[PDB]
Design a protein around this nucleic acid. Structure first.
Lengths: 158, 290, 75, 121, 217, 104
RNA sequence: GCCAACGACCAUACCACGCUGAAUACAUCGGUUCUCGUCCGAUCACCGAAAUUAAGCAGCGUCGCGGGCGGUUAGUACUUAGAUGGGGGACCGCUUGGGAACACCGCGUGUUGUUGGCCU
RNA sequence: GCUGGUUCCUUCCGAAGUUUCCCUCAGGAUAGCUGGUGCAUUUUAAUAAAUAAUCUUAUCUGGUAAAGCGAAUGAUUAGAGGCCUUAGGGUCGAAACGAUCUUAACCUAUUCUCAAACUUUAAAUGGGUAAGAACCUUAACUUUCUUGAUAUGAAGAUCAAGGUUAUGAUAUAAAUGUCCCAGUGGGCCACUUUUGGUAAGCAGAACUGGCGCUGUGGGAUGAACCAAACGUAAU
RNA sequence: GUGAAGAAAUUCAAGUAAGCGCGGGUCAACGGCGGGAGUAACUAUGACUCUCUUAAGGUAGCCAAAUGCCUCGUCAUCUAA
RNA sequence: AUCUCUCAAAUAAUAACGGAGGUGUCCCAAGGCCAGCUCAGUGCGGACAGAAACCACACAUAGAGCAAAAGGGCAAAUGCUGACUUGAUCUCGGUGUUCAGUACACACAGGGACAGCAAAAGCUCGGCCUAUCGAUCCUUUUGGUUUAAAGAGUUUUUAACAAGAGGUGUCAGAAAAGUUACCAUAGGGAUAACUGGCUUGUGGCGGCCAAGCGUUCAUAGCGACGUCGCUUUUUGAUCCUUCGAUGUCGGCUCUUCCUAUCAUUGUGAAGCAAAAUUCACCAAGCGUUGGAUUGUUCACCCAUGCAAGGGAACGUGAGCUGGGU
RNA sequence: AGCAGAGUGGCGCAGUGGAAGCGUGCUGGGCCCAUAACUCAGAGGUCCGAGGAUCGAAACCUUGCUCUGCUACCA
């Protein structure tokens, strides 16, 4: 009859997944985050002074706090419906980077350079993003082994 | 026993196997305040062997740890010190070495002259005004115990007397009697000038010839009597204050692929044929009996 | 009297009738609940940016007054 | 354990450790009491062993009947110099099969010097 | 209280445990899960046959015991006592969910209209997927007419539709019969009680070499 | 049992340093009439109304959150802080001896 | 090709066993007057080297364990979506698209930072 | 706070049966939905280089199926392999300490099955941010600072260079402050997913669609089934 | 009402009667008035013996009574049953 | 009110008087923090030495410990031991989960202070994190050394602000024992007893395979152990309809239909000689009683009978009766 | 279905965490002309079972087994 309160429902979430227990790495005690370096909020089991509570874990956010050994985030969570902002304070080793910006920054500097090579011939930019297309119309020699090549099933009886 | 015991096992990392760090000091050593972003914390490293004591200056980064300054007792042969490379007297000049070697790097050779005439002076250097903020330094004890009288503080002592900047207290010094100071400040004048060792030559000067055949050996091999030890230090210290040579070396080189030398690792063709050299022998040991 | 209760039925459908609407959108967001100062340290520097044409170039000759900055390349 | 009226924290017994320049004389004061042609086990495979005695007066001490008679057990630890690598503070590693001892190594050392024959009894 | 058999044709209650937390569990009397000559080697019984069903059918604990006894009496009256290896491959760990209705005699007079509705254990049942082999016999090849014509009288204790497989394995092992022969012939199949040894090559040498020794000498 | 030291050195609101203080109790401080409430409950029961302001049954807590006044030894200032809900209590402390067996 | 110090990623880096290790070294080893802890100078501590390459450590070997990683298992299992699709229900067959895993086979057995120094 | 009646027509729009709190559990306040009242404005408002919503692209995110016991945590069936010396019956032996099986232990290799409160990996559906001019690089200025001697760094103001603005498809128009605006705070059902119970046209739910509010063509019939959601008219 | 402090409202002191508690009396005043084992030349019993505990242990008589859940008691009789 | 593990369908959220539990404590060390030093076990050991103590040495991935339930973390620690100390501190406002993004509470990051250990860096604003708890009114301390008492002082009293505490466990807070077969009312099917309704654990009710019995003979008739199926007579279930009223239990009288057939018509079976009787198919046509106690359905009698079977709209009170209820 | 609970020496009871407690029987002797009574002495305990926590559990804890109490409904 309960959630209500403060750490219930942490079966596979809040601990350490397999073969990573014990002493923390020291890479994540080194990282640096400016204002606007978009970052994630996730779970941990090796700094037991601080957590993001039962709903947040698995969400990412902006950073507008720079402090002693903490990070204060903006994050969106579902109320019904007034989806608000929330300011959560947390010690740093709960937190991983976004890599979702980390494709986009090399989407920038290619476009500053591929326009820069375009600045000698003019046409054309072609600088937006497009997924795969309907391709072509080949003609295909066998070339490699003419047809039939006939796999027809018969397998049930066992 | 213990078959599947390997499967759920995992380790403590690499330097815990070879006993190099602790990960408990260093993390809360290099726990940089995050408000400062990547201004380095710049700790000082001192490690020791049975023959040598070492002095490093390093700082952490994201990939690892750049070590800007280094020292050994191996350089002290250039400064008139032949033997006794694990003395508290020897601990002083080693910390004194890098204490101006960084001052050649940043050009602060004039300012922060440090404690000049050392007779055991508790001299924290003052932060000067109107110009260069002094380069602070932090102390690591590595894995050794920081008891009152450890030799690692002697490496700090030449560092703090050379102009380096440390939040530094005095209760862990050798000779400062823990019940109760009573700061006998002249005990480091016996420490830094090696008199605590130089008496042991003199108090064994007439008792055992075999004492010299025992420890403080090779002083007899160079005629080092128990009288002139402090002036070897004092002449080294001004020469340390003259210039550290910054370890120029230009052999360049006899290093590469000598000779092989470490048993290149026997690929798949020489693995299974070595098995094939071993498989055909065992059927031959059965074909011998019939 | 156990009739039917506790239940989240239809309640979502009535929320997606007015759109779900990330708060507003803003540019110069508020600054509250931080380090309280840091914040007023900017207030000094907010009083500092006086020159776009007058003092911005006077220091550049004074850069060369100390024959450049060859020494402090690490610190 | 309630079996003998003895509890936690009792200060039940006395012990000590002795190493270097003093152990080699108190052992040979015991080997005459031990009649040092000792039995087979009396021995562990670690390369160290020990024994237990009655009548602790006969190692050249005064009896002094105010003190009492006492049966004693002993355990001397042989080794190889370099064994402190399992017990040093830093760079501390184990041994392997060598220089780690077997029961024969002490049984060699028991029979070569002090001439203690093994008494496989 | 030994409720009738129709009430558990469907696994629709939860996959239950048997805990070290709840005391009060009665006895599942199935203390035998295999009959026949269990002391036989693999070479004694080349033939294999199972008995299997075709649903997600829940199977009661009781006809397992009937499945023990009924085919036992036919096989001890037909083709010798020890000429087979009966195996009922299935453990009833699942529990059924009962309130007992001994609310009589007047001196108690409240318990439950349906407030509340906790459970108590009275027996066990078994949960069967599709093609889950249940009742199997490992015998010689000369009694195929003995087992299946005894297996009729066990199929009519396990409910619903059931098909009958004749294996092509060599007994209860995990190996096909024609596959069984050629790898046995040198060293690669080492005999055991009900099974064999898969590939003694790894390792690293001497176990292959000790198996190399006794087949030569 | 809550052993407490007889002396402690905490924040003093006057000296603005840490100095030794003393610590005592609160016990009850009997309702000294005729206070402002006291001159109203005694006012509204001059006769024939019968117990309007409710005098309270239904006891709940098995022990009260005890408090300890913290008198500064230096400048005689007194302060206050609660301590948590424990039935047993004593000051002075009778300091616990760790690791000793029960004698006899 | 190494060695040290500091590391970093923290098993391809581990463990069992066997073998080697030039130099630099690391160590091992030795003493107890002072610092100094000690029941115990063994662990700690101060002094420094006679002896040592045995161990440790490094390097390597094992159809070694372990782990990394590939290929098949397998479009199988489950599955979002759809139906005037059957069946007595149980449960399954199709349309729609994502799509596994242990086992089973193979390959691999530390990569590297800066700081020095060594030179087979 | 409980029942009865709450009277003229058309047009427009069109819900509730929920969370909390309460000597409340038949009622009220509360947000929620709705309606009204305008008002500010986009080459997304008047004769795009700016947005807000679904997929893509990229990036994190979880242990449910499916598995998994020849790993833990348990629980669990079969024998086998044994130097065994834990050894129970013995045996050739005074016992055997000589010797010999057997039976209990044990280990080694397995093997039959399992898990709502067991996990070594692990899906689809659905969570989360991001897909630039509110940019992107560059200067030297700013800092009354705890940090740091470039009196670095961080952020700030201000110049320098800059393509066509950076995934698809749209916008029946987007954007907000009051009245806290009348109501309503009892619900029902089918598919999958699913507890309680043997169970039911019973109860108890999460995710949708519908019924109440809704006529309708179709299984004669029937609030939900399946077609389709209802200005007056001919084809 | 009498005392002491206190500039005073007030603070306590000495007090302090009847009630209830405290000591008896009372049930033709309300209302009460137990179980446990053992034990007799068959068995069965319990004349008895021990122990438990209470304000004291249902006494003289009645009865499946109009009042005995078990009830359609066990036994003759009235009865063709 | 309140805490966990699931129940929960891999974001979070969430149900019933669903499952397993827990809490109203406890600790000046079980706190704060530096220091050393690693446990569960298990092997070989060692006078008295087993389940016995104690020392030694190896293997010891945590199989322990951590005040308490259960999860989670935990290996030169967050444990063992030791040192030394009060941050279980004053202060200001924001922020986390309860949700109306309220209040209490509890955690969390700061800014300022005062310190406490550690050589330093650091660590510390209470128990390693998920529980270990409360609002006005007052009573009441601690308070500046504080203003108010309204004409002006002085002095005491109260009065106020500010931090707590005394208190509200029905946990956002009334002070609170009974029953009415004399009971009078607003109403309710949001809520039963009665009548119908889907369901059938219950019971009447058949099928199947045959372990056996039947002298032999499994199957004449039987059929255990287990296997799976219909009816609505009851027996509960449930609350769907009627609470501004559906006259609700028996017997009498009385039409009726019903097969799962008692016996009569036509067969067949047999351990069917006959007589007698049993099985089983088809068969609702007339038949299924007269009495003792009870208020009865049944129950059990006595007798007829060459022989006495079950059932339906609770059949039926403007047909009665009223014996119970 | 909470709960008042109890189960201890042959039997009866007493025992609130440091003990195995009392009484009657039972067992032996003396005393007896022999039996009782009398007198001295001895003996008599998984504290209902399984666990919990700990310096130790009959007692503390819950859990099942046996057994009254004690009024309630109606898979």
């Amino acid at each position: 009859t309960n959630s209500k309160g403060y750490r219930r429902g942490t079966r596979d979430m809040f601990s350490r997944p397999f073969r990573k227990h014990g002493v923390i790495p020291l890479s994540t005690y080194m990282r640096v985050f400016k204002i606007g370096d978009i970052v994630d909020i996730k779970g941990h089991g090796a700094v037991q002074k601080g957590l993001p509570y039962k709903a947040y874990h698995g969400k990412t956010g902006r950073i507008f706090n720079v402090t002693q050994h903490a990070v204060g985030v903006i994050v969106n969570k579902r109320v019904r419906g007034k989806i608000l902002a929330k300011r959560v304070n947390v010690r740093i080793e709960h937190i991983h980077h976004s890599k979702c910006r980390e494709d986009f920054l090399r989407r920038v500097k290619e476009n500053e350079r591929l326009l820069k090579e375009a600045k000698e011939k003019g046409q054309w930019v072609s600088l937006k993003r497009q997924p795969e297309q309907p391709k072509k119309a080949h003609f295909v020699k066998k070339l490699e082994e003419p047809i039939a090549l006939a796999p027809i099933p018969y397998e049930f009886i066992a | 026993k213990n078959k599947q015991y390997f499967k759920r096992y995992q380790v403590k990392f690499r330097r815990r196997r070879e006993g190099k760090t602790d990960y408990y000091a260093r993390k809360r050593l290099t726990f940089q305040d995050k408000n400062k972003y990547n201004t380095p914390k710049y700790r000082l490293i001192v490690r020791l062997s049975n023959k040598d004591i070492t002095v490093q200056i390093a700082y952490a980064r994201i990939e690892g740890d750049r070590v800007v300054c280094a020292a050994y007792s191996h350089e002290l042969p250039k400064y008139g010190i032949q033997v006794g490379l694990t003395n508290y007297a020897a601990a002083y000049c080693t910390g004194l070495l890098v204490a101006r070697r960084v001052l050649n790097k940043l050009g602060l050779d004039s300012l922060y002259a440090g404690c000049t005439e050392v007779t055991g002076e508790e001299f924290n250097v003052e932060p000067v005004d109107d110009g260069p903020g002094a380069f602070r330094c932090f102390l690591d004890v590595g894995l050794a115990r920081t008891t009152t009288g450890a030799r690692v503080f002697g490496a700090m002592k030449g560092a703090v007397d050379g102009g380096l900047n440390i939040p530094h207290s005095v209760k862990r010094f050798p000779g400062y009697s823990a019940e109760t100071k009573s700061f006998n400040a002249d005990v480091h004048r016996a420490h830094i000038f090696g008199q605590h060792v130089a008496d042991y030559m003199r108090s064994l000067e007439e008792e055992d010839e075999e004492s010299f055949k025992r420890q403080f050996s090779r002083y007899i091999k160079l005629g080092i009597r128990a009288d002139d030890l402090e002036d070897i230090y004092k002449k080294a210290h001004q020469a340390i204050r003259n210039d550290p040579t910054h370890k120029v070396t230009a052999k360049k080189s006899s290093a590469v692929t000598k000779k092989r030398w470490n048993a290149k690792k026997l690929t798949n063709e020489q693995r299974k044929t070595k098995i094939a050299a071993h498989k055909a022998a065992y059927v031959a040991k059965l074909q011998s009996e019939t | 009297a156990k009739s039917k209760n506790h239940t989240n039925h239809n309640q979502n459908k009535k929320a997606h009738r007015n759109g779900i609407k990330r708060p507003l959108r803003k540019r110069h967001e508020s600054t509250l609940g931080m380090d309280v100062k840091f914040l007023i340290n900017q207030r000094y520097a907010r009083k500092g940016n006086l020159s776009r044409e007058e003092s911005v170039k006077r220091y550049n000759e004074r850069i060369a007054s100390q024959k450049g900055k060859p020494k402090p390349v690490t610190l | 354990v309630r079996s003998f009226g003895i509890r936690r924290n009792e200060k039940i017994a006395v012990h000590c450790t002795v190493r270097g320049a003093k152990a080699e004389e108190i052992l040979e004061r015991g080997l005459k009491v031990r009649e040092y042609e000792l039995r087979r086990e009396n021995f562990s495979s670690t390369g160290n062993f020990g024994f237990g005695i009655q009548e602790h007066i006969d190692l050249g001490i005064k009896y002094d009947p105010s003190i009492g008679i006492y049966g004693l057990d002993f355990y001397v630890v042989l080794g190889r110099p370099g064994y402190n690598v399992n017990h040093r503070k830093r760079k501390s590693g184990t041994v392997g099969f060598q220089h780690r001892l077997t029961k024969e190594d002490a049984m060699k050392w028991f029979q070569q010097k002090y001439d203690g024959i093994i008494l496989n009894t | 209280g030994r409720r009738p058999a129709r009430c558990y044709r469907y696994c629709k209650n939860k996959p239950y445990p048997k805990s070290r937390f709840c005391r009060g569990v009665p006895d599942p009397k199935i203390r035998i899960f295999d009959l026949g000559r269990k002391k036989a080697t693999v070479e004694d019984f080349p033939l294999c046959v199972h008995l299997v069903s075709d649903e997600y059918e829940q199977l009661s604990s009781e006809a397992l015991e009937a499945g023990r006894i009924c085919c036992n009496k036919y096989l001890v009256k037909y083709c010798g006592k020890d000429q087979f290896h009966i195996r009922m491959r299935l453990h009833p760990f699942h529990v059924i969910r009962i309130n007992k209705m001994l609310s009589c005699a007047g001196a108690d007079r409240l318990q439950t209209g349906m407030r509340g509705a906790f459970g108590k254990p009275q027996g066990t049942v078994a949960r069967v997927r599709i093609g889950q082999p249940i009742m199997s016999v490992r015998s010689s090849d000369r009694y195929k007419a003995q087992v299946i014509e005894a297996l009729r009288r066990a199929k009519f204790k396990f409910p619903g539709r059931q098909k009958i497989y004749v294996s092509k394995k060599w007994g209860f092992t995990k190996y096909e019969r024609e596959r069984y022969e050629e790898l046995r012939d040198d060293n690669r199949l080492e005999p055991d009680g009900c099974n064999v040894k898969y590939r003694p090559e790894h390792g690293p040498i001497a176990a292959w070499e000790k198996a190399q020794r006794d087949v030569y000498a | 049992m809550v052993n407490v030291p007889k002396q402690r050195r905490t924040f003093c609101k006057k000296c603005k340093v840490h100095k030794l203080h003393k610590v005592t109790q609160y016990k009850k401080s009997k309702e000294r009439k005729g206070a402002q409430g006291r001159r109203r409950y005694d006012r509204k029961q001059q006769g024939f109304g019968g117990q309007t302001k409710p005098i309270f049954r239904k006891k709940a807590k098995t022990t009260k959150k005890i408090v300890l006044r913290m008198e500064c030894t230096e400048c005689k200032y007194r302060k206050q802080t609660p301590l948590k809900r424990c039935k047993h209590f004593e000051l002075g402390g009778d300091k616990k001896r760790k690791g000793q067996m029960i004698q006899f």
